[PDB]
Amino acid sequence: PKYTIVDKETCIACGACGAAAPDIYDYDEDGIAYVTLDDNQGIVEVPDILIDDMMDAFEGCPTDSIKVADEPFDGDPNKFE
């Protein structure tokens, strides 16, 4: 499976990821992206049909703030660093 999460500390509120994958990423009041599937906890598996959109958003993020993994993040966007 695949899991995703936003490191909100490095996000620059550019708007690209919600356009590339609107069913996965949205923005808080401050314009900072988060994963709507699981309230940015990195615990809900991304549906198979959405993986291509997720990878588009991941590759397109200017500051490498979107994370992807094959194992849950359990709330920590920096788990795999």
Ligand code: SF4
């Ligand atoms: S693409 Fe990256 S920097 Fe831009 S809003 Fe999404 S997470 Fe933030």
